[PDB]
Structure formats: structure tokens, C-alpha cells
Amino acid sequence: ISASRKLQLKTLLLQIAKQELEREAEERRGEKGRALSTRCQPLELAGLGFAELQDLCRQLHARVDKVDEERYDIEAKVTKNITEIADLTQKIFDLRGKFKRPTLRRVRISADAMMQALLGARAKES
């Protein structure tokens, strides 16, 4: 496989993985909307009586406590896996590192500036 072919292959692959990221994320987000409608179901407020609405607010406040607690547990776990990602990426990055160091140069006189400092007016596309 020659040069431009491989360039196009891999850049189009990156686009394909982007599109699969898109489909996976839209799956996740439709799932979110549907699951949220499913769990926390909209209230039925019409015509509800006074003391009725008092006790209902209390029960839904217990519901606040439950759901908040539970999502917050998912949150704490996520934070633990966050520290896990940070520190394991740190770890491996170091194992990756000690030689991984990506850097830039500037000893590269770019062919625009190069060919102009050479050609003057003749460096028209150069």
C-alpha cells in the first residue's frame, strides 16, 4: 500500500470510529431519556387535594433522598474509577514514559520560509 492510500485509509477510519462513537453515544442518550422517564415518572398534580399534596410531597421527598443517594453512589464509584484512571494512566504513562516524551523541534525551516529565503519572487508557490 502506497502513501496517499494509507493516509486516506487511516483518516477515514478515524472518521468511521467517530461515527461509531456517535451511534454509541446516541444509543446511550436515547437510553438516558427513556430510562429517566421510566424511573422518575412525571407527577400527576391535577385536582389533587391539599393534605393529599402535603403527603405526596413528603413521599416524593423520600424519593429525592433515595434517587439522590443512589446516583450519588454511582457518582462516588465514578470518582473512584476516576482516580483509578488518573493514577493507572499515570502509572503506565510512566512505564510508557522515561522514554515516551513527545516533543517539538524548530530546527525545521518550513519549506515556505525555506523556499522563500531561497527564491524571493520566484518562491510564488514556494
Binding site: 477510519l13 472518521q15 462513537l21 529565503a117
Partner: protein
């Protein structure tokens, strides 16, 4: 060593003939008629700068896939479009995780050849098994037959 050909695929040919004449003066007074150390040196000198023959011979070898050791005029044009700003930006680990969860449809932490094959067939470009094969092999430095996630960083390091 090839991305420069890929960039001239994106670039024009008038620059190729300007570099033909370039190479000609780049060997103005040459010992080998191609760009050895001192030829690239007098290139930099006409550029107004003074290089060292080590990096000279190195940029000579920076394209050296076969071990050609020299600057063929073809390899010369390669080296000269190396310095034009054509494709940049060095794609890497983060977006590569974002894309590797996909490229690892198997979610192995390693792109098996299944996902790579399918997503290439999806790339829209013609898909050879030289494509998918070289891509698996360059990804997989552990050569497990599956492109590890960091082997996928390798797989999509910089390829604009």
C-alpha cells in the same frame, strides 16, 4: 517517509518542478550529484544558515525506509515537501480512546482484526487486506493479532 507523498497528492506539481531546479542547485558543486551531507549543507547555506552533516545525513535517512542512505531526487522531493505545512496535528491518546471504544467493538482493550476490517470497509476508501493487515500489524506491536488501545494510539498517532 510516505506521508510526504500523501501530501503532494494533496499538493500541486509546479512545486515539484521548482524543487527539481532546487535539487539541481542543491547539488551545485556536489560530490555525488544527489543531496549528501554537504549538499544539504549548501542548501541551508543558500538558505542563509549553516547546518551540521549529521542532521544532514539524518534528514537524508529520516525518509530511509529501505536503507537507501542517500537523497534520491525522488526522496529529495519527499524531503522538500517534508518542510511545507501540509498535514499536521498528531492525533493521539484521548480522542483515540474515544474512537478506540469503537475500533474495539470487541472492547478488548485491543482492536481485533474484526473491528478494524469492518471500519475500514466503512472508511469509503478501497479496502485491501494489505490495508487491514498492515494496520493490525502497526497497531499491534505486541503482535497479538489485535491492536491494543495504546497499540491503537500507535495505530492512529498523527495520521491526518
Amino acid at each position: 517517509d510516505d506521508i510526504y507523498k500523501a501530501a503532494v497528492e494533496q499538493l500541486t506539481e509546479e512545486q515539484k518542478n521548482e524543487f527539481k531546479a532546487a535539487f539541481d542547485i542543491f547539488v551545485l558543486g556536489a560530490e555525488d550529484g544527489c543531496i549528501s551531507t554537504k549538499e544539504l549543507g549548501k542548501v541551508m547555506r543558500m538558505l542563509g544558515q549553516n547546518p551540521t552533516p549529521e542532521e544532514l545525513q539524518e534528514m537524508i535517512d529520516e525518509v530511509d525506509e529501505d536503507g537507501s542512505g542517500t537523497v534520491d531526487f525522488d526522496e529529495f522531493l519527499v524531503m522538500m515537501v517534508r518542510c511545507m505545512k501540509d498535514d499536521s496535528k498528531g492525533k493521539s491518546e484521548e480522542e483515540l480512546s474515544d474512537l478506540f471504544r469503537m475500533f474495539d467493538k470487541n472492547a478488548d482493550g485491543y482492536i481485533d482484526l474484526d473491528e478494524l476490517k469492518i471500519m475500514l470497509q466503512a472508511t469509503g476508501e478501497t479496502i485491501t487486506e494489505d490495508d487491514i493487515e498492515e494496520l493490525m500489524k502497526d497497531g499491534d506491536k505486541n503482535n497479538d493479532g489485535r491492536i491494543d488501545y495504546d497499540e491503537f494510539l500507535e495505530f492512529m498517532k498523527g495520521v491526518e
